[PDB]
Coordinates of C-alpha atoms and ligand atoms in Angstrom, one line a residue:
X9 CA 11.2 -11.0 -12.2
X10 CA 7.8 -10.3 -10.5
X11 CA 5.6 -7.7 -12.6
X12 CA 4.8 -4.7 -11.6
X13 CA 1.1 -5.3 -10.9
X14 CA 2.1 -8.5 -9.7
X15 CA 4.3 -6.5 -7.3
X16 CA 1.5 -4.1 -6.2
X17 CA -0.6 -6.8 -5.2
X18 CA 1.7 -8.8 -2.8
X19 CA 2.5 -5.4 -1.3
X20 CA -0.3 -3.4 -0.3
X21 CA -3.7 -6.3 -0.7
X22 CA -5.1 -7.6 2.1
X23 CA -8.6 -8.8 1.7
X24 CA -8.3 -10.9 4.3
X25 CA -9.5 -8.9 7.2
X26 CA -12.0 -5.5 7.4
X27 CA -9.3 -3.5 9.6
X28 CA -6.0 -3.9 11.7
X29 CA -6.9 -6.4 14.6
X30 CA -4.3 -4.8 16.9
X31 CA -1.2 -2.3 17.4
X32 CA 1.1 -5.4 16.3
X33 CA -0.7 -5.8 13.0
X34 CA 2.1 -3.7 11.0
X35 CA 5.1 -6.2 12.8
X36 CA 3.5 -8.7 11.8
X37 CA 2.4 -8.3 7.6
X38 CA 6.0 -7.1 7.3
X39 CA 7.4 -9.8 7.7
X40 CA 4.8 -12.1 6.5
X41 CA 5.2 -10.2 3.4
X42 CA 8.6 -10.4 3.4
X43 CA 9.5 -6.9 3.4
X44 CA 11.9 -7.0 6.0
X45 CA 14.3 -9.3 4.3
X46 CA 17.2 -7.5 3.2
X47 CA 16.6 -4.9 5.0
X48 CA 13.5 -2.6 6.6
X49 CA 10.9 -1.2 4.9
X50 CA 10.1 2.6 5.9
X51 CA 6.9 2.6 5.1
X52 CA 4.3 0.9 3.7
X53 CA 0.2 0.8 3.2
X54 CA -2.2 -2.0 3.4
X55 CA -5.6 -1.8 1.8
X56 CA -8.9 -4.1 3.1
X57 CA -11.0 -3.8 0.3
X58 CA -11.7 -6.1 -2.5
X59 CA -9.0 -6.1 -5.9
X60 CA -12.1 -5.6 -8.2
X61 CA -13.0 -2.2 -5.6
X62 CA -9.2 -1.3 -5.7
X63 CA -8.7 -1.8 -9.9
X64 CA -11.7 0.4 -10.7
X65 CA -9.8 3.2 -8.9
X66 CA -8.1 3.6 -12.3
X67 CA -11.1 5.0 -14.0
X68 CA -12.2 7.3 -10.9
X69 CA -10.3 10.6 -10.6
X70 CA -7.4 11.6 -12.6
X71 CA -4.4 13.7 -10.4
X72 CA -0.9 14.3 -10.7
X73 CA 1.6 11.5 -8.8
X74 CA 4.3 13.3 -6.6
X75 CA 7.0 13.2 -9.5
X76 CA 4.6 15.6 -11.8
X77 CA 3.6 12.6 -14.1
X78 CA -0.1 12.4 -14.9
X79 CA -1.1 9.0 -14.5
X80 CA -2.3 8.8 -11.0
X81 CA -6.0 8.3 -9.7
X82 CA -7.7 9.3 -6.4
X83 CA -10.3 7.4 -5.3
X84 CA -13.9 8.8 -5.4
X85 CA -14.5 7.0 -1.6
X86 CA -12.8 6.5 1.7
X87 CA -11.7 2.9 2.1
X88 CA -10.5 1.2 4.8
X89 CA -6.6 1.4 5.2
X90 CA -3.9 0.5 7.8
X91 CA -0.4 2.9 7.6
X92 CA 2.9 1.1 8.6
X93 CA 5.7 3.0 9.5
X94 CA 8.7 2.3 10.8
X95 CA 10.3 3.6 14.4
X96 CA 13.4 5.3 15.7
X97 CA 15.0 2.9 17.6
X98 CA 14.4 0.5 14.7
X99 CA 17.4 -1.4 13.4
X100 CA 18.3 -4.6 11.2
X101 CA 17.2 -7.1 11.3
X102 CA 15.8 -6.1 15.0
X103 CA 12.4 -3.9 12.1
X104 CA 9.8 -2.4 14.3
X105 CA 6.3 -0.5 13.5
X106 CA 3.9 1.8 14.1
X107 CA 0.2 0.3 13.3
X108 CA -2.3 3.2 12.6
X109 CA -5.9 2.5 11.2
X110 CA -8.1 4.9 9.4
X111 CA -10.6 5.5 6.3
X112 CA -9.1 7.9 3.8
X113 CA -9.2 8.2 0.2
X114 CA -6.3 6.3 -1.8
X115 CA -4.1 7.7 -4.8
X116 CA -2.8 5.3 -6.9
X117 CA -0.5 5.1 -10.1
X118 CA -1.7 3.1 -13.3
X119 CA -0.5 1.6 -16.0
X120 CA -0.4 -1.2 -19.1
X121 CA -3.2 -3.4 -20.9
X122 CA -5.0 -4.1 -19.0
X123 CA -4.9 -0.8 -17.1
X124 CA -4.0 -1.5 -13.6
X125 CA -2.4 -0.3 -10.5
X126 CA 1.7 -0.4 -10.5
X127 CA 2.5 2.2 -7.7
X128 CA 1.0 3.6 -4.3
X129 CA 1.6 7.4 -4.4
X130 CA -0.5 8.4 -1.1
X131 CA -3.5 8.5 0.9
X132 CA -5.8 11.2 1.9
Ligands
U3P332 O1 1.7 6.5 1.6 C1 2.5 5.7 1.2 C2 3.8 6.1 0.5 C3 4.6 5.2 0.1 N1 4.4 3.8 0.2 C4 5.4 2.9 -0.3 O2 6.7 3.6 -0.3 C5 7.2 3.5 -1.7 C6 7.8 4.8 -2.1 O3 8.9 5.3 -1.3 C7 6.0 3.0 -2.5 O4 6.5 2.2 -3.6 P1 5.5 1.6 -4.7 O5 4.5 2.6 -5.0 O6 6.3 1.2 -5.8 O7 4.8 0.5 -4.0 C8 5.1 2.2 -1.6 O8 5.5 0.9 -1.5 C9 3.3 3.4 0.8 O9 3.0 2.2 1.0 N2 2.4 4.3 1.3

C-alpha cells in the first residue's frame, strides 16, 4: 500500500549520519527499518547523501538494470554508502550482518511523474 518511491526511500535513505558509526551499524538499521520482520533481509544498501543529491541521479547517466530494461542511471560521483549483508550462521528471527563502508558510484532504477527512484540495482 506504500508506493514505490515511497518504498525506496524508507529502504535505502539515511541522511542522518555522513558514514556507518561502527561494525554494528547494519544490525542495527535492519531492524530499525523493519526489514527483519517476517523474515531476514539478504541484502540491502544504505545511502548518506541528501534525497535532492540522490533524485538528480535520474538525469545523470543512462545504463542498462540487471534484467536488460533501460531505465537505470549511474551516478556521475562516488557517494558515500554502507553495504549490509547478511551472515552464514544467520537464522530467524536470530538476523545477523556484515557492516562494510565505502564511496562508490550508485545505479539506480527510475520511474513515473515525477521521475524518481523506484529500485536499487547496484553499486560500483
Ligand atoms: O546492491 C544491492 C542489490 C540489491 N539490493 C536490494 O536487494 C533487492 C533485490 O534483490 C533490491 O530491491 P529494490 O531495488 O526493489 O529495493 C534492494 O532492496 C540492495 O540494497 N543493494
Amino acid at each position: 500500500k506504500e508506493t514505490a518511491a515511497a518504498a525506496f526511500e524508507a529502504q535505502h535513505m539515511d541522511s542522518s549520519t555522513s558514514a556507518a558509526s561502527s561494525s554494528n551499524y547494519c544490525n542495527q538499521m535492519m531492524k530499525s527499518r523493519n526489514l527483519t520482520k517476517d523474515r531476514c533481509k539478504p541484502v540491502n544498501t544504505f545511502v548518506h547523501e541528501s534525497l535532492a543529491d540522490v533524485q538528480a541521479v535520474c538525469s545523470q547517466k543512462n545504463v542498462a538494470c540487471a534484467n536488460g530494461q533501460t531505465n537505470c542511471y549511474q551516478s556521475y560521483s562516488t557517494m558515500s554508502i554502507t553495504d549490509c549483508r547478511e551472515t552464514g550462521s544467520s537464522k530467524y528471527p536470530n538476523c545477523a550482518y556484515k557492516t562494510t563502508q565505502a564511496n562508490k558510484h550508485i545505479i539506480v532504477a527510475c520511474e513515473g511523474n515525477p521521475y524518481v527512484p523506484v529500485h536499487f540495482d547496484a553499486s560500483v
